[PDB]
């Protein structure tokens, strides 16, 4: 419904080769008509120095997810999307397991996209909430 | 002036072992009475899938830098600091070289710290601006 | 369910006397177990100079609504709540009618609250999305 | 220097007639080659119900100031500017006197502008910091 390109999880994951998403173990997990989901491990790759998930790593996940979502929503033969503004509240710390982000659209305009991204640890309790504004730019 | 613990760059860099900062090559570079500076490479470790610096990686740098700055400003025998809210505008893309962040204090309160963090590529032009709110929490 | 103090719309409205909410015609309209709703006129009181709803006025509505929601959730004999951080995306312009905001909780912690606030004009299309962080402060 | 149209404080003030800025007593006060300054009373017009400056009112001031700054920087025969994203940290409460905002440019791009807006009460201590993203839109 939301998507122009039907998401293919294998393809999404493969596109990350040689980029931070691959390095951090970000995995696109699921999608439906209204959302796209990706997860990331909470370990030494994503920890800050006191053994908690680094808040910036949560934002890497959010922006990876939202950027990919935007990519799937535009005519890629005429446009590309880059992040313009991002913000996040850090709600709960995580030490282990994985953190899962779900992206939903707030607004898909001609020049900007705004995504609502909700993160939670394996216990299912909200860990982070982010909002991401993407600029839509002519090729 | 700002600092409680005088920053020692060697020590800052070493504290990152086995955390994302180490993995991404974040390097604490300089400090003075009013600021703390760190840089990060722009390469396959920090790229998004189209060869640009991932916006989330800019935020990892900003939050690494600001969190460390907060750590240096509190009585660590009674308090620790965790990120509470972060936001950033993405101003210009970067493809190579390093991105350098400079953190300056907006407000150091008893329960929150607010940091102004300015990022730029090797050409010196502003690439990202972030603001980070840290919560100050009793041990 | 969310609430400690059961919302009473008359008191909420009456409490705005001699404050900006009264000046701008903010009206608390509705509530349920999970949300609180207020609306505001789009007119000369809330316009910017070009005849569109001022983006700051959208934020006054959001912050009025979320701050009141926080007040209804804390023990007011021991605590009061103040805005700590606010952010908003301006999605669509509005010229007339009313703008309606709905607040839902993202997280009610011991020291901070985070509210999701969605605004729309009379056509029902999203016009602004805000996120508000409140500090919970001992009297 | 920053400016395309040279700021004229009388016109800026006069232009607010029949809009929220006039209602709240926003006064454009000063400018130089790099900044624009406006102030606002802290009184019943701008209070929240507990007698503190409403955090949204701080944002009205910031967005009025930054939007006017954008208008003075674009070619107004081809473009107009609207708020796209705004965020603020509320640093200190204010009860009386005036709050003064100073706007400085972070980035004036072709399609977006980013403004740094610093607010303080009459004691000169930082009371709020805002960042505003404006969209540049063809007429």
Q: In the B/D pair of chains, how many CB contacts fall below 8 A? A: 38
Q: What are phi and psi of C44, to 5 degrees?
A: -60, -25
DSSP A19: S
The partner residue sitting opposite D89, judged by closest CB among B91, B114, B129, is: B114
Distance from CA of A5 to the nearest CA of D (A): 27
Q: What angle do CA C45, D132, B21 make, to 5 degrees?
A: 150
For residues D105 and D113, what is the distance between their CA atoms, to the nearest angstrom?
8
Strands laid side by side in the D79-90 sheet: C27-31, C35-41, C98-108, C112-120, C126-138, C79-90, D79-90, D126-138, D112-120, D98-108, D35-41, D27-31
**How far, in Å, CA of A79 to CA of C7, rounded?**
48
In the annotation, is D34 catalytic?
no
For chain D, the straight-line distance linking the first and the last C-alpha, in angstroms and rounded, comes to 25
Per the listing, tokens 């308090």 go with: B79
Q: How many CB atoms lie within 10 A of CB C34?
A: 12
R_g (Cα) of chain A, nearest Å: 14
* Cβ of residue A5 closer than 8 Å to a chain B Cβ: no
C-alpha–C-alpha distance, residues C80 and C70, integer Å: 9
Interchain pair D88, C85: CB under 8 A: yes
Contacts of A53 (CB under 8 A, 6+ apart): A42, A46, A47, A93, A94, A95, A99, A127
The DSSP annotation for B26-74 comes to -EEEEE-SSEEEEEEE-STTTB-TTSSBPHHHHHHHHHHHHHHHHHTTS
Q: Is B14 helix (H, G, I), strand (E, B) or coil?
A: helix
DSSP reduced 3-state for A71: helix
What token pair was written down for C78?
């021991």
Residues A56 and B59 sit within 8 Å (Cβ to Cβ):
yes
Interface test with C, best of B88, B89, B135, B138 (most C CBs within 10 A): B135
Tally: H helices and E strands in chain A: 3, 6
Q: Are C26 and C41 in contact (CB under 8 A)?
A: no
Going by C-alpha positions, the residue among B90, B97, B103 that lies closest to residue B123 is: B97
Distance, in Å, from the CA atom of D41 to the CA atom of D21, rounded to the nearest integer, reads: 11
Tell me which chain B residues have a C-beta less than 8 angstroms from the C-beta of D129: 106-107, 114, 116, 131
Tell me A5's DSSP state. Answer: S
Angle at A111 between CA A107 and CA A114, to 5 degrees: 30
- How far apart are alpha carbons A9 and C49 in whole angstroms? 48
Helix (H) or strand (E) holding A16: none
Does B64 contact A at CB distance below 8 Å? yes
- Largest Cα–Cα distance in chain D? 45
Cβ burial, residue C11 (10 Å; 0-12/13-18/19+): exposed
- Does C48 touch chain D if contact means CB atoms closer than 8 Å? yes
Q: Which residues contact D85 (CB under 8 A, 6 or more apart)?
A: A84, A85, A133, C87, C88, C89, C90, D132, D133
Region of residue B97 (phi > 0: left; psi between -120 and 50: alpha; otherwise: beta)? left
**Dihedral pair phi/psi, residue D60, rounded to 5°:** -55, -45
Q: Is the dihedral of CA C83, A85, D132, A112 positive or negative?
A: negative
State the catalytic residue, choosing from B10, B29, B34, B63. B63
Coil, helix or strand at residue B84: strand
For D131, the 3-state DSSP assignment is strand
Residues with Cβ within 8 Å of B42's Cβ and at least 6 positions away in sequence, in order, are: B53, B94, B95, B96, B97, B98, B99, B121
Compute chain D's Rg from CA coordinates. Answer: 14
Chains touching A (3+ CB pairs < 8 Å): B, C, D
Secondary element (H or E) of residue C65: helix C55-71
Structure tokens at C136: 């919970």
Least Cα distance to B12 among B33, B32, B37, B34 occurs for: B37
**D85 contacts in chain A (CB < 8 Å):** 84-85, 133
Tokens representing residue D56 in the block? 């949204």
Kindly report the number of other CB atoms within 10 A of residue C18's CB atom: 14
What tokens were used for A132?
A: 């991401």
CATH number of the domain within which A11 lies: 3.10.129.10
Pick the closest to residue B76 from B7, B1, B139, B6 (CA basis): B139
Please give the residue of chain D at the shortest CA–CA distance from A85.
D85
Classify strands C112-120 and B27-31 as parallel, antiparallel or unpaired.
Answer: unpaired
* Residue of chain B whose Cα is closest to the Cα of C136: B111
Please count the structural domains in chain D.
1
| CA–CA–CA angle A41, A45, A46 (5° rounding) | 65
Measured between alpha carbons, how far is A78 from C99 in angstroms, rounded to an integer? 35
**Residues followed by a break in chain B, C–N over 2.5 Å?**
none
Total number of residues shown for chain C: 139
Q: Does D117 touch chain B (CB under 8 A)?
A: no
Distinct helix (H) and strand (E) counts, chain C: 3, 6
- Cα C114 to chain centroid distance, Å, stands at 12
Task: Please state, as a whole number, how many other Cβ atoms lie within 10 Å of the Cβ of residue A50.
Answer: 15
Residue B75 half-sphere exposure toward CB, CA atoms < 13 A: 7
Question: Which residue of A106, A132, A135, A136 to mutate against D (max D Cβ within 10 Å)?
Answer: A135
Tokens coding C84: 């700590």
| DSSP structure class, residue C6 | P
Q: Which of A107, A84, A99 minimizes the C-alpha distance to A54? A: A99
- Cβ pair B135:C87 closer than 8 A: no
Contact residues, chain D, for A87 at CB < 8 Å: 87
Q: How far apart are CA C126 and CA A106, in angstroms?
A: 8
Contact (CB<8Å) D67/C85: no
Q: How many CA atoms within 13 Å lie on the side-chain side of C76?
A: 12
The reply to whether A84 touches chain D by the CB within 8 Å rule is: yes
DSSP string of C13-54, one letter each residue: HHTTTTSHHHHHT-EEEEE-SSEEEEEEE-STTTB-TTSSBP
Contacts of A17 (CB under 8 A, 6+ apart): none
Give the torsion sign (CA, B47, B50, B51, B53): negative
Is residue A2 within 8 Å of residue A73, measured between CB atoms? Answer: yes
Taking CA–CA distances from A43, the nearest residue in chain B reads B19
Q: Rounded to an integer, what distance in angstroms lies between the CA atom of residue A126 and that of residue C107?
A: 8
Resolution in A: 1.6
Token couple for A28: 């696109």
Query: DSSP letter string over D14-67?
Result: HTTTTSHHHHHT-EEEEE-SSEEEEEEE-STTTB-TTSSBPHHHHHHHHHHHHH
DSSP code per residue over A20-59: HHHHTT-EEEEE-SSEEEEEEE-STTTB-TTSSBPHHHHH
Query: Of C28, C39, C99, B45, whose CA–CA distance to D49 is shortest?
Result: C28
Q: Token digits for B128? A: 């990202």
State the DSSP code for C7: P
Specify the DSSP class assigned to residue B15: T
Residues of B in contact with A70 (CB under 8 A): none
Chain breaks in chain D following residues, C–N > 2.5 Å: none
Cβ density class B14-36: b for 16+ within 10 Å, e for less: ebbeebbbbbbebbbbebeeebb
In chain A, what are the helix, strand and coil shares in percent, each to the nearest 5? 20, 40, 40
Answer whether D104 touches C (CB < 8 Å).
Answer: no
- Exposure string of B102-128, with b = 16+ CB inside 10 Å and e = fewer, is bbebbbbeebbbbbbbbbbbeeeeebb
DSSP, collapsed to helix, strand or coil, labels residue C116 as: strand
Which residue range(s) make up the domain with C123?
1-139
Q: Which two tokens stand for residue D109?
A: 């791009």
Do C46 and C103 contact (CB within 8 A), yes or no?
A: no
Contacts of B84 in chain C (CB under 8 A): 85, 112, 133
Distance between CA atoms of residues C92 and A112, nearest Å: 12
Residue pair D37/D102 in contact by the 8 Å Cβ criterion: yes
User: CA nearest B60 in A: which residue?
Assistant: A56
**Which of A19, A23, A63 has the CB atom closest to B55's CB atom?**
A63
Q: Are B1 and B31 in contact (CB under 8 A)?
A: no
Of D41, D102, B87, the C-alpha closest to C23 is D41
């Amino acid at each position: 419904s939301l998507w122009r390109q039907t998401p293919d999880l294998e393809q999404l994951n493969a596109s990350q080769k040689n980029s931070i998403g691959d390095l951090l173990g970000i995995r696109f997990e699921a999608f439906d008509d209204e959302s796209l989901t990706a997860s990331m491990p909470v370990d030494s790759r994503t920890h800050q120095p006191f053994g908690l998930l680094h808040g910036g790593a949560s934002v890497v996940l959010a922006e990876s997810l939202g950027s990919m979502a935007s990519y799937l929503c535009v005519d890629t033969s005429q446009y590309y999307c880059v992040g313009l503004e991002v913000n996040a509240n850090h709600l709960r710390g995580l030490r282990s397991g994985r953190v899962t982000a779900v992206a939903r659209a707030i607004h898909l305009g001609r020049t900007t996209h705004v995504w609502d991204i909700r993160l939670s640890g394996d216990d299912g309790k909200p860990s982070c909430i982010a909002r991401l504004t993407m600029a839509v730019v002519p090729l």
